[PDB]
Design a protein around this ligand. Sequence first.
Ligand SMILES: [K+]
Ligand SMILES: [K+]
Ligand SMILES: [K+]
Ligand SMILES: [Mg+2]
Ligand SMILES: [Mg+2]
Ligand SMILES: [Mg+2]
Ligand SMILES: [Mg+2]
Ligand SMILES: [Mg+2]
Ligand SMILES: [Mg+2]
Ligand SMILES: [Mg+2]
Ligand SMILES: [Mg+2]
Ligand SMILES: [Mg+2]
Ligand SMILES: [Mg+2]
Ligand SMILES: [Mg+2]
Ligand SMILES: [Mg+2]
Ligand SMILES: [Mg+2]
Ligand SMILES: [Mg+2]
Ligand SMILES: [Mg+2]
Ligand SMILES: [Mg+2]
Ligand SMILES: [Mg+2]
Ligand SMILES: [Mg+2]
Ligand code: NA
Ligand code: NA
Ligand code: NA
Ligand code: NA
Lengths: 96, 378, 64
Amino acid sequence: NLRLQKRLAADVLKCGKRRVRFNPAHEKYIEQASSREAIRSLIESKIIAKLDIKGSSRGRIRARHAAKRLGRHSGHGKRRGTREARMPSKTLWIQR
Amino acid sequence: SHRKFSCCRKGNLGYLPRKRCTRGRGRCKTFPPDVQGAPIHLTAFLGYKAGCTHVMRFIDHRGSNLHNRQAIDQATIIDAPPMICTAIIGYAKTPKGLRAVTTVWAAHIAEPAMRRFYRNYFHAEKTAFSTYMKKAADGTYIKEQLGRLKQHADVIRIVAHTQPALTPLKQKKADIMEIQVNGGASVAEKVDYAYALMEKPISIKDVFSVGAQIDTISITRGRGFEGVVTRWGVTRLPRKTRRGNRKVACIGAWHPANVQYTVARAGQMGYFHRTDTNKQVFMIDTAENPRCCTTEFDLTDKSINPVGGFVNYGRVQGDFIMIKGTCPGPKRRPVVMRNALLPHRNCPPVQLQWISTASKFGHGIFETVEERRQFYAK
Amino acid sequence: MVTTNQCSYSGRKILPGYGKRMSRHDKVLLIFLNRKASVHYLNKWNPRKIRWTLASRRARGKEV
RNA sequence: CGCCCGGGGAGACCACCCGGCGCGGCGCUCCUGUACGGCGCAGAGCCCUGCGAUCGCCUGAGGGACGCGCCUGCAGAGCGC
RNA sequence: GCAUGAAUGGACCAACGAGGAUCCCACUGUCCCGAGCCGCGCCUCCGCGAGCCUCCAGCCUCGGGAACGGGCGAGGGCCGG
RNA sequence: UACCGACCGCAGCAGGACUCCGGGGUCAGCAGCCUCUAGCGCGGGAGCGAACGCGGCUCAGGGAAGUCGGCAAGCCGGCUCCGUAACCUCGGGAAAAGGAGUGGCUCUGACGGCCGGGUCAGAACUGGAACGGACGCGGGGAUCCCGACUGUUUACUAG
Ligand SMILES: [K+]
Ligand SMILES: [K+]
Ligand SMILES: [K+]
Ligand SMILES: [Mg+2]
Ligand SMILES: [Mg+2]
Ligand SMILES: [Mg+2]
Ligand SMILES: [Mg+2]
Ligand SMILES: [Mg+2]
Ligand SMILES: [Mg+2]
Ligand SMILES: [Mg+2]
Ligand SMILES: [Mg+2]
Ligand SMILES: [Mg+2]
Ligand SMILES: [Mg+2]
Ligand SMILES: [Mg+2]
Ligand SMILES: [Mg+2]
Ligand SMILES: [Mg+2]
Ligand SMILES: [Mg+2]
Ligand SMILES: [Mg+2]
Ligand SMILES: [Mg+2]
Ligand SMILES: [Mg+2]
Ligand SMILES: [Mg+2]
Ligand code: NA
Ligand code: NA
Ligand code: NA
Ligand code: NA
């Protein structure tokens, strides 16, 4: 029942406890640890670690935006929203 | 008060109760009547349902719009491997009805019948007819029993069994049937005729002829437990009904204070014992003949077996019969054929011109595999 | 049977009792092999670009 | 004057009809509609020694199968009565 | 005009209405006339496990009778679960 | 001064219960759909694939003949351009009615500043005669009665 160790590990590493991961071959060492200092020692030796954030890739988005700058994906079938909503007349007049 | 509009009941009350058939297969309840002096002949046969197909024929029917032109008709194929006669049974007419006199078995019996006598052949001890076959080695006992039958019987039947090894079925035990002998001038002629074909094969070619009519007896397709709308064909209720609308609204009046047997209820549907009558024979041939289904308007030889095989049925190995129309049951169901009791009077003669042999698995357009290979540059 | 028809859409051969025929207002009779063919025609799909038809195979040179 | 067990053409459970079952392959048939990749003086054009949606050839191809025919594999006849 | 009628307001009325009513176009299983399919329940199993109701009982026809009987008189049927 | 929607509804009850912080993509949008961060698998499982029910889908030809009654379901729907009647309290009616287009790819022009930005317009080519391809999102018209209109009402059968 390693519920206590996960909470302390997430506190020490400053992450969500969904990101804390144990090494399933030294489970008794982790079981003996009950304080933040023992957790710090185990983190030192790599028995406890956290994972990187699983950031979402932006490769498709950047390619699409480059194409849009070129002039693609801009016809009447792709465009739902009035032209006043897409570009107000007041703004145009103010700039002019 | 009285029902306002006129309408009939729904369904036939002569086919009650609608329960699963408790007879092993289709049985012949009655045989054609025996008329003295006509040539001696057999009256029935047993086969297996194989498939359906097309035929083009020429119609000569004076007084109809079809009298001098072509028509496309539906046909059914029944696989009819030869039967083996193996016993003789005689009956006496009595004030209590038809009573058996005695039954005489042949000296040697084939393996399929023996199998029919047990439930598990491999484990069962083999004792059936063990004493009888020693007694009947010589012909004396058979002769004595046949003399008894000659002096005491009024109706003569033979006992024949099928040979499932000549079919694509998984069954190994045979079906045993009684077949009546009709005609002749006396019972002695019948007994001698029946004795002349004991332990011998009987071909369907010697029982029926092309252009005659037959009755078919079988067991229909099963559907399990079914509701009233499908079981009896009653009207559905309108959409706003609470608790569904597939049922009978009123199942009786206040009095009598019971439910009558004439009211539609849910229960078993299908797997019934039925008999269709007055089916015309189109062709009797064998799959061993390469020109089995070739006619005057064809070129390359075509046999009965279609391209790709009979769907949900093995291939036909030997003799078969073709009938006009449909018969009860699915494919592989045993079917008993019988001479018609009350045949239709005005039937035009049969004149086949073309038989369809394309693939029934899917939509085929090739009548032979050679044509297909030619077409696909194979 | 010798007397067989040709599908109007795909150019394949049809055996007796195996399809449907339509009569147009212009008094022209179309013959179809199956339901797949009649749906193709009814949707106005050009047979010259359906690769299993004869019209398409001729344009490609496979059929002479 | 047997069942248990397995499979259906049988089926709510049962029963019924049949059994040295079946799994996994190969061939036939037929469903879709011509695979990925490679190669093209193919390709509207362009900021062009490269980018490019598409098109042609290998390719009635590739993928799939609950129907039919075989077995070159593995297997399949055991407890209560 | 059984028995309309003038701030117990009379007549009319554009806009508005989850208000009452008639018809036309389009649309459709509302219907002729039903068929096939998907998921959950139902059904079989392991675990868990109630309410309502209850003179006694639980097959019919006729008779008479508090004038429409399960029991009474006379007939016809029905192993038990 | 811990902690909780651990509060009230007879309960560890699909009800009720105030406020603060608020990423990415598609988009007019804090709508619908998918998602990073964070949190987490909730009155238990297995088999089978009958009737019948509850919640959904498709259906030839016809098209309200059904029914007290078009109830239920279906049709329409985004954006751009074209075109819009009688009547009227002259403000409306009006999205009246009714037509056409919309994908992908390769290009051309227009609009600022002493490189930035998106939007709008036009052309060639090319895909089963296909493009608001999921989602989201008016069916319309001709009349009569009543009340001018926005608003309120019988908590639990009458809006
Ligand atoms: K009547
Ligand atoms: K209202
Ligand atoms: K504190
Ligand atoms: Mg209701
Ligand atoms: Mg078929
Ligand atoms: Mg079945
Ligand atoms: Mg008055
Ligand atoms: Mg006055
Ligand atoms: Mg008044
Ligand atoms: Mg009583
Ligand atoms: Mg009594
Ligand atoms: Mg605190
Ligand atoms: Mg209280
Ligand atoms: Mg709650
Ligand atoms: Mg009507
Ligand atoms: Mg009516
Ligand atoms: Mg409605
Ligand atoms: Mg009002
Ligand atoms: Mg209001
Ligand atoms: Mg109320
Ligand atoms: Mg209300
Ligand atoms: Na303005
Ligand atoms: Na390719
Ligand atoms: Na009574
Ligand atoms: Na949202």
